[PDB]
Design a protein around this ligand. Structure first.
Ligand SMILES: NC(=O)c1ccc[n+]([C@@H]2O[C@H](COP(=O)([O-])OP(=O)(O)OC[C@H]3O[C@@H](n4cnc5c(N)ncnc54)[C@H](OP(=O)(O)O)[C@@H]3O)[C@@H](O)[C@H]2O)c1
Lengths: 329, 327, 327, 329, 329, 327
């Protein structure tokens, strides 16, 4: 019950869509002692401090590529939510090392600084793009996920648990598809570009993600890659919600984009454990002090999966109509 | 043209390393061949087996940008083969693999641009296509860095390409050579992972010739893939042991049943050729290039929309008798 | 001459940033304009609003010397506008402001000399004259570094100048634009700091034109100051709200009642011109310069011994009606 | 009473005028367990160890720009006096980054290393040149002062107090004015250069400064910029003490020099608190665990000041005659 | 008695001749809780894990030139054996900075990381080449030895003892003389090269070295340079054991080679203490908390030496015949 | 040829430092002499005593590679005299001595190659031959780095040599000058270490002339050793105090009874000359050199097989009367 009770939480990339939503959720629904936003931009932090004018907030201007600054911010932290990252796929293809420095080396420093300040639980955000990735960005998240999972194979005088939360497209995220079909039809959208007529994706709301991360804290043992069960929607149906009466030119594809997204690769189905509405991808490596992932801290039991299971988007159980999208737009 | 050129190869004391050096001495007119690796043990031995004037050894680490700057001084061609490739060990030492493979790639690129090297080819791997293990992810980032490196421009231009191929028959501590120490071990029990297991197979000599060919074809920015045969991991044992038991020890941390070399989501970037494949960059360059015509004037063509070059669905297969011919 | 030149501007996605880019495209013949900033959000948007061939974006941090080296490759002109300027936030995150503003300045200078950039202009601020807050101190060190950078010499010379001016009307999150969100907020209560509060006021467009003019005037080593109007912070509210209460919320961490732009102890270094002021270096250079004649052959003159260009004692003042004309 | 009793003290720039005087004062008047001199030059340390041949002394060759070395020296220290710096104003104008590295980054590393080794009290030396500065040097001290004051806004498992001590010209300092009018008249001073006939400065003795720093330790809460009440003297009267019978040519001004020095800027008078003979400039930012600066640890009460107060040299209460200067030369 | 009982041991350069032998000795003869091999090559570690397939083993891929990685590996270690190094003398002459980075800076980081993780005992391996050295390699070991000895002059909240073990040529080491006269006669040795006909060296077996290091742990106080009493053999007699029936061409000398090796320099005989079969070269500097090196932890008493003693190889008590060499080949 | 050349000398404010500068101004036509050292105290004073246009001071640390890069810009000759030499202090602060002497040497070499300096001479010491103390070990590594630095090659070549000699009579805080402050101290008690104590003795002026001569002789890679006299440490007191007691205070941390300058195990590398010795490199270079003929065409010759240049067995000795003539 309420384990953020009197705990100090630090969230990197805290000024982003997830960050503001996560901070908002934690402030409203928990007795967290203090909530630390760790990010770089003074503009956004300056703005955020005004809209979240709360004494339980602390803003540290800092970069996840700077270990000394992180070591200083995590000082006395209990829980670290790692949401900082460079995720604009095509921009990442043109700026490889930047994305590597922020996502890979950033993961690296956060883990180092958390261990040093003896943090209790750490959850880093992943992405479906990190499974059998093709673009660099996805490659940097895969390296990220791997570091956090491996970070558990440590042995300090205070067990620090490291877990990962992976989920697909965030319906209407700060720069996604939905938040475009609105910004275009607002400035006389001559026509809203599309791509492949097979394009499918997983879907979830920002609130669902936050809630999920918040709950993963309650059942995590450390080492897990939690995957929530979410619905998928073909990119066509997403053409009748923010401009059905406006044509949509066909672009086909964009740099480093897939036709379908993978959440749980086939080659990892033996590590995958199933639950009522979420999966647990177990560590591919073994830890010194092994844990039993079949029983979460929330005493929710899990069963393995089909030796030939593949949790992909091109074909999942749940889907969504252009109404549900507006009903949850 | 390698004539009178200076060539540096990171990870020069490795399998590919030794073989590449041997091939360059014997067949090219390279003026100088520089080996850049960390271990003094392997370098002293290698200098003994290759007692040749055109050879030069530099004790160095790719994680050291300053040292690379120093050693790439006056080099025309750079072959990047340095890496931590043990997949399961990379799973336990992720940051080590990231520093060597990813940062390593970054430094090399930096030193190469600085010393104005003409062409660079970095060695990739099939494990970098739709990767699952850390090693593959690092190599994927590596390929990316090298491909992106082509957008840099100054008083001098540098061409960066990548060569990607699967398992190397009898590579430094691989499977095939292991299926020997077992025969010698008077042991009668072959350790398998999964009857479905499949991989692409290229020879040390073939990989090396493909790199040399690539140098002559590259515009810069390509990921060259040689068309090589696949082989059921069930026959690799059969062939190298027609009689002996196969104890299914399961899968190791990070293994795939089949390795992809040209992902399905990249078929549109692929260009087919007589013996090879060029996966085109996914980004545009200041100075565009036409990958349909190599520098050797070889014409390439697009592949079918649902194309994918994997080990499972390969039209070529190594025969247990034609495999024994490799060794 | 910006004709056919390559221009890089750190902090290119900022207010001055976007405006400077717009002015350079529309009016110059600059061959290439490079935006160098950290955020992918602002850069993707900016590339959309400026869909032009001569534009190029580099995701980078001024705290990264290696990345700057890379991006300044082949650049002729460099405009340094990157900085952490929120005064109170700089008061809580001093080292952050020091790293970005002071170290940032240092790296840029280094990369500029390395890539042999012809001219560099760094943006200063009135808060850097007889400063009190951390931000101002960092900018003061910045100006100093840039001014001192002119003593460096090699096969190529690089000119470093600084442009200093006060508040930018309606700048990214300033006061004036805030006195709008309040009107919209249906709020009837204007937050003031002190009836005496005074500041210099220049427009985004004016600041930009002054930088472009400076490039054409600079010998290297100058701190250009434009003659701009002052305005009682009491009228900025009056003008933008002839009717509404003013609740004196006091002073914020680090504020001054009046901002100096040319200190009294520097009057001897000052040179007066038609529209601007040049504060001469306090040190001597290997290659001296005559700051009394800009490159546009504009003749300057010394000011009175007890001279000081402050906001409190300014001979020019923005009229609440002529202020509404800015917006 | 005697709080250096059995404490280990580390003083950076310990081989300088202040350092030798401070070490001398501490050795003679306290039961400090050990006194660590942290500086770079082997020559001076070598010399100092001979003149201060005391077992309670420890000399660490080190640079304040090297965090690892500092982390190693502060190990087990209780009190840190930070006196290291580059202060030759004109030399600083020609060597900007050097002065920045030593004074700014140096401040930076000392604070970091003190926190890491859980030091109790830290006092960094400032200078009147840091108030409304014009020269770079002064700018580096202002950045310094700001870092030390901000360093208090931390929260480690052992409160470390950070304070600053600022005062003007040190009568006859290792390279000042007085110690020149002697070195010139000794080698047939044809004429001793002067400047502006309005030039005024604050004055204090090396011993007074040491004593002041030593007492600031006894009353500091952490976060203060202590300013002692000291006298001022026009640069003319300082022309009749070490060569009244020798002319003085007029140079006018030197690189980055002011006519008058500011100790407490007008724009900070609201932060300024007054006491019988010293001031306390309060933090412009607020700390999490606020302290009451109106009551020092020495139970000395302070009152605010005139809303339009300015503690400048061009006009202060106390002044000095060319006798007092020789009477205290 | 058995002080490795339940202790965690970390040995850098653990995949080398010494490393494998040392790990082998510790696994077989002690109740060490865990044994950590710290080295760079995946090939060797991969190989070693197979031949030493023991649960009490842990392999960390790491470089001694990387402090952050070391800080992470020594975490929770009790005893550190430092065997990592670049020792190919001529290769070191052509790659000076490399050898300096690995041996000097490597020593530097290990000491730093051991202190940080509060290691109990640390023994770094030296070499007779470090006494009055001529080659760079030897110069890097001398700098190394000096750092470890000096490392004792520290004062942390957990005394860490630092000692050095120095001995000569390891009979048949991974790349020495003996292991050559075999690899040559195996591939039709036309003739096996030799040098100066005065060439003498000290000798010892790999097992003797391990055992010695293992025992130095039991009697060390910290600060010692233990030197075992070992025999010497002229390079001629070493020509009748692995090819007496094959001629030996005369090369004379090689880059940076001496005619004779020094173990205890004459100028240090006043620091040297003698024992039944090993020497103790005492610190040239004095520590704050001085120890009595005349009485080892094994209660073995030692007496000083002749004020003009020199422990060189060109003339020592024990020697060896080409039989003993094969009898112990 | 120092004519119209730019000379930088690290540790320029030191004993050798000041003397070298004085000799270069007075006798050469060097266009510029740059002093690169850390302390502002000593530099401000030195600039006063050397108020000359060709002088220039750079506040910097040899541990700073970036700063060295900056200061060596446009330098032709580099004299490396910066170091921590106090033997006992180096014994307590080993890493400090290693950073300054060893890393310091490394950075200087790096910056020199980068800025394409023509010739570099680094100051060594007798304590670096068959060393025992940390200081000597660091200098030995230093010499090595500099000697090895000659194997680097690019569009420009740089020559690196080392000058090695013993004690400098009355050097900044040495023995002789101390045996003065004792006389002045009205003290009647001379502190000795050991009646056998012996050292080589060269004058500040001699060391400086030998460096200047070396520049004119060097091919690059040599360790020049001047033939200088030895002197019983018993006479240095006798001479400077014919009457006063000698209280044997023993030996200090790291002292030798006698200092070697050319080790016995190096006699084969030595080449004898009229006034000096060249110890040849122990490694071979890409571009070999003939050290038997300096650039001044001085012919050298091999020494006897068991040769060794030590202070104990020197054929030259300073006479207590000819020593007083030095001072
Ligand atoms: N002294 C002798 O009797 C003797 C005998 C044989 C050989 N030598 C050789 O002569 C050389 C110089 O001797 P010296 O008597 O002129 O010594 P010195 O009087 O101690 O001068 C050495 C100078 O090096 C500078 N320095 C020290 N650390 C530095 C750093 N980290 N970065 C930049 N500069 C640094 C110091 O200047 P700052 O403190 O202002 O930085 C100092 O002025 C030595 O290297 C030694 O090898 C001396």
């Amino acid at each position: 019950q309420n384990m953020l009770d009197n705990q100090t939480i630090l969230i990197t990339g805290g000024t982003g869509s997830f960050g503001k939503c996560f901070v908002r959720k934690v402030l409203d629904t928990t007795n967290a002692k203090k909530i630390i936003v760790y990010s770089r931009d003074e503009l956004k932090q300056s703005e955020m401090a005004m809209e979240f004018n709360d004494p339980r907030m602390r803003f540290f201007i800092g970069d996840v590529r700077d270990l000394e600054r992180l070591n200083y911010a995590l000082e006395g932290v209990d829980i670290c939510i790692h949401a900082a990252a460079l995720k604009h796929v095509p921009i990442a293809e043109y700026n490889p090392l930047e994305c590597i420095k922020t996502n890979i080396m950033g993961a690296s420093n956060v883990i180092n600084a958390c261990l040093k300040n003896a943090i209790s639980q750490v959850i880093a955000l992943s992405t479906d793009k990190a499974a059998n990735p093709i673009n660099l960005y996805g490659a940097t998240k895969l390296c990220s996920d791997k570091l956090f999972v491996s970070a558990n194979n440590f042995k300090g005088s205070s067990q620090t648990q490291f877990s990962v939360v992976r989920y697909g497209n965030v319906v209407g995220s700060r720069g996604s598809v939905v938040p475009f079909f609105k910004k275009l039809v607002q400035n006389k959208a001559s026509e809203i570009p599309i791509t492949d007529i097979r394009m499918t994706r997983f879907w979830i709301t920002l609130d669902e993600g936050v809630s999920f991360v918040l709950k993963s804290l309650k059942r995590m043992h450390g080492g897990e890659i939690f995957v929530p069960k979410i619905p998928s929607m073909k990119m066509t149906d997403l053409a009748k919600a923010l401009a059905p009466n406006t044509p949509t030119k066909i672009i086909g594809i964009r740099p480093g984009e897939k036709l379908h997204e993978v959440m749980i690769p086939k080659d990892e189905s033996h590590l995958a454990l199933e639950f009522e509405d979420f999966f647990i991808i177990q560590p591919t490596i073994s830890f010194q002090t092994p844990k039993d992932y079949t029983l979460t801290k929330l005493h929710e039991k899990g069963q393995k999966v089909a030796p030939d299971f593949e949790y992909s988007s091109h074909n999942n159980n749940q889907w969504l109509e252009p109404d549900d999208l507006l009903k949850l737009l």
